[PDB]
Paper text:
Here, we report that the outer membrane lipoprotein QseG functions as an accessory protein that directly binds to and activates the histidine kinase QseE via its C-terminal domain. QseEF, a TCS responsive to multiple ligands including phosphate, sulfate, adrenaline, and AI-3, is essential for the virulence of pathogenic Enterobacteriaceae. Notably, genomic analyses reveal that a third gene qseG is co-transcribed with qseE and qseF, encoding an outer membrane lipoprotein anchored to the inner leaflet via N-terminal lipid modification. Collectively, our findings establish QseG as an endogenous activator of the QseEF signaling pathway via a conserved regulatory mechanism.
To elucidate the molecular basis of QseE activation by QseG, we sought to determine the 3D structure of the QseG-QseE complex. Purified QseG37-221-QseE complex was successfully obtained and subjected to cryo-EM analysis, yielding a 3.9 Å resolution map. Due to the inherent flexibility of HK structural domains in the cytoplasm, the transmembrane and cytoplasmic domains of QseE—including HAMP domain (a domain found in histidine kinase, adenylate cyclase, methyl-accepting protein, and phosphatase), DHp domain (dimerization and histidine phosphotransfer), and CA domain (catalytic and ATP-binding)—were not resolved. The final model was limited to the periplasmic region, including QseG58-220 and QseE34-173. Notably, two-dimensional and three-dimensional classifications revealed at least two distinct conformations of the QseG-QseE complex: one in which QseG aligns upright with the QseE dimerization interface and another in which QseG adopts a tilted conformation while interacting with QseE. The complex structure reveals a C2-symmetric QseG-QseE heteromeric tetramer comprising one QseG homodimer unit and one QseE homodimer unit. The C-terminal region of QseG forms a scissor-like structure that straddles the saddle-shaped dimeric sensor domains of QseE, consistent with our pull-down assay findings. Detailed structural analysis revealed that the interaction between QseG and QseE is mediated by both hydrophobic and polar interactions. Specifically, Leu209 of QseG forms hydrophobic contacts with Val77 and Leu78 of QseE. Additionally, Glu213 and Arg214 of QseG establish hydrogen bonds/salt bridges with Arg70, Gln74, Asp80, and Thr82 of QseE. Furthermore, Arg219 of QseG forms hydrogen bonds/salt bridges with Glu69 and Glu140 of QseE, whereas Lys220 of QseG interacts with Glu67 via hydrogen bonds/salt bridges.
Author numbering:
A (entry chain D), B (entry chain C): 26 to 181
C (entry chain A), D (entry chain B): 58 to 220
The structure:
Amino acid sequence: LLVLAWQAWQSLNALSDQAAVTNRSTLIDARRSEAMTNVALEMERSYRQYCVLDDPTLAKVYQSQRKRYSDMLDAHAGVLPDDKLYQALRQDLNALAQLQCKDSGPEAAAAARLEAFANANTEMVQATRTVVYSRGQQLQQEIAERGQFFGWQALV
Amino acid sequence: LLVLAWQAWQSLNALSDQAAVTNRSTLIDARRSEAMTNVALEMERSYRQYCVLDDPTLAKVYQSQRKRYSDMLDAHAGVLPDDKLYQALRQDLNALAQLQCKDSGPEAAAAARLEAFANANTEMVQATRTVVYSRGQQLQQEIAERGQFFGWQALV
Amino acid sequence: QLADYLPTACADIWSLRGQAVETNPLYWLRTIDCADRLMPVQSRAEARALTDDNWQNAFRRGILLADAKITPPERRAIVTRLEALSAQIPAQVRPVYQIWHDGQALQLALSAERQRYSKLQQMSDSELDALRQQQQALQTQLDLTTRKLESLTDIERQLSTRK
Amino acid sequence: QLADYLPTACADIWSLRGQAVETNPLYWLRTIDCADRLMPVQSRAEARALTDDNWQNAFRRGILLADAKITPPERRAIVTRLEALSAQIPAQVRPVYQIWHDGQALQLALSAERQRYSKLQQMSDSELDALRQQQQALQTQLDLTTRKLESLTDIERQLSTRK
């Protein structure tokens, strides 16, 4: 019957497109989150080193790193369902735009917000990993539903 | 006949299992490669800082990082199709065990070796990401071809 | 044939003048041995009534004010002045004049030596103070740099152990 | 009344020996004149053979070897020797003894002051050398530390540029 051929075509198209886009998006999201955490750690290190060792070149390097992190954060908003957490990360990053500390170490509130920034970035990478696993499991469940439909059609 | 439908159902379930395991393995491979490159960068930083400062505590930190990278390398042998470059990384990492240097800087042979090690680690991450595309595209192509073959060859 | 006046008091011998007596040194020795035992303020009081236009009066003024504790500007002035005294002097008093001149010479030489010693001591103290303060500044600079190094290494260790 | 011998003839003042001129000071003014006006080497040569225990002989020996750049130790020794023998000084001869002792003792004081000044200068130079070498050591420590800091910053820059 024509129904079998039509459903085969739809299955091919849907499964192929979903498999390709899910693989690519998951890989991009994982790599982006890992680079996010790494540049956050580098951000903290550059901040501390500039505060201990006063030098405008360290400030320029920190500016470049902050711009890179802001760009990379702007390309990850559409994946995490809760926009509040992404906006909080953006606000913390923009709060870390200035380098100010009186003593050798950073400002006390600066230290607290840096620790909050690190914890939030760790939670961000965890949430991105969970969403990636969710997308993979969703592909698995959809293809399982297709298999169940095939089994129901097997009754004839 | 119903035997064809049963075979299609079983093949689809096996394909679902394959898709899930491929997704999980690919994600863990990407994460492992990124952590590999980050640990290599931290290795370089720790080596240079210990050579400049001559602090046994930095040496112990470098030993811990080297052990972590050795584990990570041991947990990645079975993915890369070729073995020469992986064995080269293993040998380079093992030989980068002692910290021998003069006048606040690694000796010239050690410096060139470290550079080459960084380039080879970049080649590792590139090759494993190529294998990632290979596995994803293999799953995509094989599911598409199986679907099209079953749809076209069962039109009667 | 020269008489002796040593046993008698030195006041009248110091008071008397005349060319007849001036040809004998013995009364000059009497005056010099009386002047030191005299009260320096009383010596100044008795020498104030003297003048400097003649060699004898300037000579005895030098004796009277030499033993007194005086600042060496006027001592230098009088030892530069007594060349006029040397311009007119009989041979009898030349030896004692020479001895007095040597005495004043080593006096002012000792004063100049002690002033040179004080100047060198103060110069050495000043240079020592300057070198000590420079050392303190450089030590503070080393403390600052070693604190910076220690803090930087500590932040590196903390970030390493965060992982 | 004392006989006058104003001309100075040192060739026979040893021969007179002072047995009859002990009351006339001009004898020892002649002695000091002929001592300081003559070449001291002949004075030392003649004083070598003179008596030492006799008070007048020791006195004249002291005058005749008082010059020719003699070392301060034996100088203080000999003036103390005359002070030990200062019990035989005649009253008429007392003032010249007093002035001679004052001159000699002040010469010893000047020499001691010179020695003290030289000693203070040499301690000052030693302390300056010690402080200079300590400053050099601390300066090389500081430049080593700042070199380490510069190297650390340079490796940070290099690794940042690596990415």
